[PDB]
Scaffold this active site. Structure first.
Site, short mmCIF file in Angstrom:
data_model
loop_
_atom_site.label_atom_id
_atom_site.label_comp_id
_atom_site.label_asym_id
_atom_site.label_seq_id
_atom_site.Cartn_x
_atom_site.Cartn_y
_atom_site.Cartn_z
N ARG A 9 48.85 41.68 22.77
CA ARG A 9 47.32 41.22 23.13
C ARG A 9 46.62 42.58 23.31
O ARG A 9 47.28 43.77 23.23
CB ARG A 9 46.51 40.21 24.12
CG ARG A 9 47.13 38.72 24.01
CD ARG A 9 47.16 37.87 24.87
NE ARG A 9 46.58 38.11 26.23
CZ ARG A 9 45.89 37.96 26.15
NH1 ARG A 9 44.88 36.65 24.75
NH2 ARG A 9 44.19 37.58 26.99
N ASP A 71 51.96 33.10 31.60
CA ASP A 71 50.11 32.61 30.51
C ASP A 71 51.41 31.50 29.15
O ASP A 71 51.41 31.37 28.08
CB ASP A 71 50.13 33.72 29.55
CG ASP A 71 49.45 34.54 30.58
OD1 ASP A 71 48.67 33.52 31.74
OD2 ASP A 71 48.83 36.03 30.51
#
Length: 330
Positions: A9, A71
């Site tokens: 990310r 996550d």
């Protein structure tokens, strides 16, 4: 492969986490070439942080992806696995105080002080522990939440993960580290997980060097607990694990959204942190989405069993009613 492609990310914190894992890889595999590919990313959705990077894995556009382990859902899509659980950084939740409140704790804040957190888990537990503080949603990345705290005079404090503040180089802003009796952490918090294609043996070989046995066993127990409860994102569920004196201790809890209903219990198992590596068979199933065939399997099964045991104890004391009520609140 000539070049190992690492997906990440684009947020600063995600990029720092990815660089730290790549640096560890390079220390084990000097001269091996790594290429970082940062991808634009985004109740309801079950895997906000993982879907696009999983699609890049599926198209062989990257070879491994670095995530905060919390996550990653406890059930991954069938073509993926967690190929490495890195040595845990500090798992605890942390308080950052408004500069006017340096030297304080949540316990010494004036009543009706406003504390910013958007986490259902943090909010349930801290409302239970601090019934006369006001816990109010706050939005933004780490930088933005710090700015909202320091300026708009709304917030006396915010709650963030210790590990996030430390990775950003903001260790000095950690004013209080919450004990488990104040706020237990999210399943997997503070550990980094490396996600890869489930049958990509070459890459599983390479990243297996990153597995930390103590952290792997703790995270298997935490994830197996959450999976057996099916907590998802809509129900406050939290854990604490410790390996000491030959035991693995798992504490697990569920709360109503306001924290007024709670079930929490601790179980332990005799589990030795294995010091040896192995070359385990390729057809051994993953455990809660984790492949660790180079770490003895016996302890991993024992840790998964501890997590299931504790979830079953909580269910026998009524956890399903709390989960169902919390989830009916979408």
């Amino acid at each position: 492969m000539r070049v190992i492609r690492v997906g990440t990310r684009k947020s600063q914190l995600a990029r720092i986490q990815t660089d730290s894992v790549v640096a560890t890889l390079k220390a084990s595999y000097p001269g091996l070439q790594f290429e970082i590919i940062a991808m634009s990313t985004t109740i309801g959705e079950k895997s906000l942080f993982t879907k696009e990077l999983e699609h890049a894995l599926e198209k062989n556009e990257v070879d491994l992806v670095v995530h905060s382990l919390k996550d990653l859902p406890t059930v991954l899509p069938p073509g993926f696995t967690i190929g490495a659980i890195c040595k845990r950084e500090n798992p605890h939740d942390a308080v950052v105080f408004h500069p006017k409140f340096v030297g304080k704790t949540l316990e010494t804040l004036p009543e009706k002080s406003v504390v910013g957190t958007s986490s259902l888990r943090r909010a349930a537990q801290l409302q239970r522990k601090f019934p006369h503080l006001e816990f109010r949603s706050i939005q933004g990345n780490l930088n933005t939440r710090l700015r909202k705290l320091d300026e708009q005079q709304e917030f006396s404090a915010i709650i963030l993960a210790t590990a996030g503040l430390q990775r950003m180089g903001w260790h000095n802003r950690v004013g209080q580290i919450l004990h488990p009796e104040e706020c237990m952490y999210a399943v997997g918090q503070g550990a980094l997980g490396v996600e890869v294609r489930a049958k990509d043996q070459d890459i599983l070989d390479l990243v297996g060097v990153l597995h930390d046995p103590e952290t792997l066993l703790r995270c298997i127990a935490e994830r197996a607990f959450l999976r057996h409860l099916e907590g998802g994102c809509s129900v406050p569920v939290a854990v604490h694990t410790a390996m000491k004196d030959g035991q693995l201790y798992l504490t697990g809890g569920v709360w109503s959204l306001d924290g007024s209903d709670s079930i929490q219990e601790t179980m332990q198992a005799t589990i030795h942190v294995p010091a040896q590596h192995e070359d385990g068979p390729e057809d051994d199933p993953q455990l809660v989405g984790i492949t660790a065939r180079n770490i003895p399997r016996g302890p991993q099964l024992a840790a998964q069993n501890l997590g299931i045991s504790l979830a079953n104890l909580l269910l026998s004391k009524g956890a399903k009613n709390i989960l169902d009520v919390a989830r009916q609140l979408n």
